[PDB]
Amino acid sequence: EELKNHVYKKTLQALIYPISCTTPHNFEVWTATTPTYCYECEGLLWGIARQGMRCTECGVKCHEKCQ
C-alpha cells in the first residue's frame, strides 16, 4: 500500500507538470567587466577573475558554478 500510494502521488506530480513542459538555458560565457551579483547565489562576479554565464533565452546572469 505505502509504495503504491507514494507512487500514485509521484506519478500524478510527475505528469501534471510533465518534465516535457521544460526549456533549456542557452548560456554564453560572459565577463562581469564590473562587480556583479549572481542571480542564483547573489555572490560576486568580477572581471576575468570571477566570470559568469549570461543566458540568452533566460537572459540570466550567474556564476559558472551557479548556471
Place this chain on the structure above:
Amino acid sequence: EELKNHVYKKTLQALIYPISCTTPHNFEVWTATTPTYCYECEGLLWGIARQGMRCTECGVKCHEKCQDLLNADCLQRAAEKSSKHGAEDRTQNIIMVLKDRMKIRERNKPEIFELIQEVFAVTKSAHTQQMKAVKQSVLDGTSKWSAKISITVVCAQGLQAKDKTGSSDPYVTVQVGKTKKRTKTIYGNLNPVWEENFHFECHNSSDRIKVRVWDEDDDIKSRVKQRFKRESDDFLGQTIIEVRTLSGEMDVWYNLDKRTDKSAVSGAIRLHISVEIKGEEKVAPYHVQYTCLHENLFHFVTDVQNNGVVKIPDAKGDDAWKVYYDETAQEIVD
C-alpha cells in the same frame, strides 16, 4: 630618398607607440538574451540567433564578426566599452595612457628616436617636428574617425523624365551631416555623366551620406515653387549610404528612391566616394621598408658609429643570425 624618408617616418610612428604598448581582448561568447547593438557596427545582437562576444578585460559587447573589427587594443576598447556602458571619461584617460606611453617611451628610450634620427641623418629640431607629426599621427590620431569624404558624383542611368526639354536636365545634390553641395547640370539627358566631386567632413561612422538627383527647372514655375518648397528642381531620385559602409576609395552605382510630394523616380546613380580614414596605404611592401631601415641602420652602425668596423651585435645564440644589432637598433628593426 622617397623610401628612406617614408621609412624614417614609419619607423618613428612604429616605435613612438611601439606595438608592445598593446593589450589583448579576453572575449567570452555572450548571448544577447535581449535585442542589443554591437559596440563596433551598432548592428543587432539578439538571442541565440545573433549572439555576441562580451570581453571581460575590455568588457566590450559586439558581434562575433565584430570582435576583431573592434580595432584598438584592450586598453583602448576597455575605454570605448566604458563609454558605451556609461563612463566616457575613461576614453580621455586612455588617450592620456596613449600620451603617457609615448612620453615614457621617449623619456626612457630617447636613444631609439635619436638613433632613427641619426640613421636617417635627420636634424634634432626637424626630428622634433616630424616627431610632433608622428606623435600627432597617434595622439591627434589617438581615437579618431574624423573622416574627410570626397564624393564624385560620376553618372546616372535610366532616370525619370521631368524636363522643359521632355527628357531631364539632371543635376545632383550631395549632403553629409547638415552640409549640402551640388553638381552642375547635365541637360536633356536620362543617362547623364557629371564626374563632379564634393568634399565633406564626417565625425561619426553612423552618419549618412544623402545623394539626390534634380531636374534643373529655371522657369516661372520654379521661381514660384522656391516660395513653398526647398527643392525647386523636379526631383529625379535619391540614394542614402551609411558612413560605415565606406572605406578608403569606392566607385559604386546605387538604384534611386523617392523623397518629395513631386517624386517620380527610376534608374540608378554612380558615385565614386573617397574616405580619408585612409592613411599610409603608400607602403613599400613592408619587406622593402624594413630593408631600407636595415641598410641605413647597418651602414650607420658599421660605418658611422664603428668607422667601417663591423661591431658583431648584442646577439643571442646561433640566433645571432636573428639579432642583427644592439637592443636599441634590434628593437627598431623588430
